[PDB]
């Protein structure tokens, strides 16, 4: 039964090393597993001149350490059938490895060798320079991303969050061996990191290995200080990048979210579950339970749309994004804002009952495999300062009711000045003022 299975889930053991680093894990019967380090560092931590370092770094983090050059490092990882991957966002970076539970210890050593001894060979840096520049031109052709960057760029204009994770063209062309080193030294530090592991591994054996390769301890009190970042100011505004030569338009609209800590985030996610998402290959078609999806199908409003509750430490973005033909942008936006107002004013107990079930299934799905369970642990500790089980989440979710959703949505959406990003043949969508008025009266 559901209720019980949630309980039987093996607890997450957490222990901190006296040097500031935390070690957590969820042990399963699995023969395979995943372990990696989740760092509290990204583009929000960068400045005007070093924007992109965290990314330029992410590229070299695999070209070998000093303890072992490129060919060696790679060969050593490949030849043991382990997968090495990672990423870098705005407030979070992570490098994790997928391998057989056996290699668990050798893995840790490698993780540690990367986060601490990245070689940063200079001949490599002049190569990644071209590689990155290319990835910028390739990603520049992904409207969905060009659009969320523009959303951020304007929503948080004049602040850290307004920057792209990949950085600027100028920075990539001029970043120095120094800057990269400086970035790693300044940011990749024990108290700001978490060693997470999921699969068939012993917490004990895990923490042991940590102490062994995650040594370097701090003397001063500042080395154990986790800096609190300067708050980013939200701005109701819009950026419209117009190009009629593009096939379809992209629109993203959003209001400021609460930030990880806030319990309202639960409700908001339930809300998003009511509006849901949609794309032209959804077989449900005209029968989908999402009113917006239905209209979308009935009136051919868009190629796709999605709601999002992008959380950050102290802020966030709660909105939606849709792709649609040049001549249906207006109606789509109209019906979309409509559904938002419906949220603040008339949500039913029937809609929520379903939204909760969709959300429960969604959270469980985020724990399908070791890599995703590891990602959850890495982020939970880093963002909530601990792990929140499915048993707890579910409790929170069960507490949400129509009444609640209305009050929470009214709180963050009703009569607010949104941030708007529009890219492509956007002539039919127009005037901030008109969009603004859409923010009130069901």
């Amino acid at each position: 039964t559901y209720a019980q299975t949630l309980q039987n889930i093996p607890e997450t053991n957490v222990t901190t090393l006296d040097n500031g680093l935390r070690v957590a894990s969820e042990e399963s019967s699995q023969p395979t597993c995943t372990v990696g380090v989740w760092i509290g560092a990204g583009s929000r931590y960068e400045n005007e001149k070093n924007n992109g370092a965290g990314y330029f770094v992410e590229h070299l983090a695999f070209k070998g350490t000093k303890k072992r050059p490129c060919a060696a490092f790679e060969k050593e990882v490949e030849s043991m059938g382990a997968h090495f991957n990672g990423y870098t966002s705005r407030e979070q970076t992570a490098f994790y490895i997928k391998a057989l539970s056996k290699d668990m210890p050798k893995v840790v050593e490698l993780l540690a060798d990367v986060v601490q001894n990245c070689a940063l060979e200079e001949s490599q840096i002049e190569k990644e320079r071209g590689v990155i520049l290319q990835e910028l031109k390739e990603m520049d052709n992904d409207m969905t991303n060009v659009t969320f960057d523009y959303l951020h760029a304007t929503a948080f204009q004049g602040t850290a969050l307004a920057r792209t994770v990949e950085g600027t063209t100028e920075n990539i062309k001029h970043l120095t061996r120094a800057d990269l080193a400086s970035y790693i030294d300044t940011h990749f530090k024990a108290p700001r990191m978490v060693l997470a592991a999921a699969g068939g591994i012993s917490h004990k054996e895990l923490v042991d290995a940590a102490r062994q390769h995650f040594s370097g301890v701090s003397f001063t009190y500042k080395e154990d200080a986790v800096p609190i970042l300067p708050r980013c100011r939200f701005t109701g505004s819009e950026i419209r990048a117009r190009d009629d030569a593009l096939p379809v338009a992209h629109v993203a609209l959003a209001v400021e979210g609460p930030g990880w800590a806030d319990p309202d985030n639960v409700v908001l996610h339930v809300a998003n579950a009511i509006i849901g998402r949609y794309d032209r290959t959804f077989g449900g078609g005209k029968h989908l339970s999402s009113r917006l999806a239905a209209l979308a199908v009935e009136h051919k409003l868009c190629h796709s749309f999605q709601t999002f509750n992008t959380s950050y430490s102290d802020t966030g973005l709660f909105g939606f994004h849709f792709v649609a033909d040049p001549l249906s942008i207006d109606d789509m936006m109209f019906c979309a804002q409509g559904e938002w107002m419906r949220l603040c004013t008339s949500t039913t107990e029937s809609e929520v009952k379903r939204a909760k079930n969709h959300l429960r299934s969604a959270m469980v799905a985020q724990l399908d495999g070791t890599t995703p369970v590891c990602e959850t642990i890495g982020s939970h500790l880093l963002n909530y300062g601990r792990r929140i089980s499915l048993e707890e989440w579910d409790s929170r979710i069960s507490a949400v009711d129509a009444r609640m959703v209305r009050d929470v949505c009214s709180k963050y959406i009703y009569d607010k000045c949104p941030a708007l990003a529009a890219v492509g043949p956007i002539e039919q969508l127009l005037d901030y003022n008109r969009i603004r008025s859409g923010m009130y009266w069901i």
């Binding site: 209209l295 409003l301 109606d331 109209f334 019906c335």
Partner: protein
């Protein structure tokens, strides 16, 4: 039609000439007289009827 402002044979008219009607972003105050002329006209008619009744 999703919004009853585009489909309705009458609200479509009020809409397509006073609400969604595309206007140049830079017309000056010298473009304000058309509406005044209109309002004036409805006004003359109303006061005229009131007088014609006596």
């Amino acid at each position: 039609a999703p919004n009853i402002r585009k489909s309705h044979p009458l609200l479509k008219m009020i809409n397509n000439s006073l609400i969604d009607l595309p206007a140049p972003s830079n017309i000056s105050a010298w473009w304000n007289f058309g509406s005044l002329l209109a309002v004036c006209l409805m006004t003359q008619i109303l006061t005229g009827l009131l007088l014609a009744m006596h």
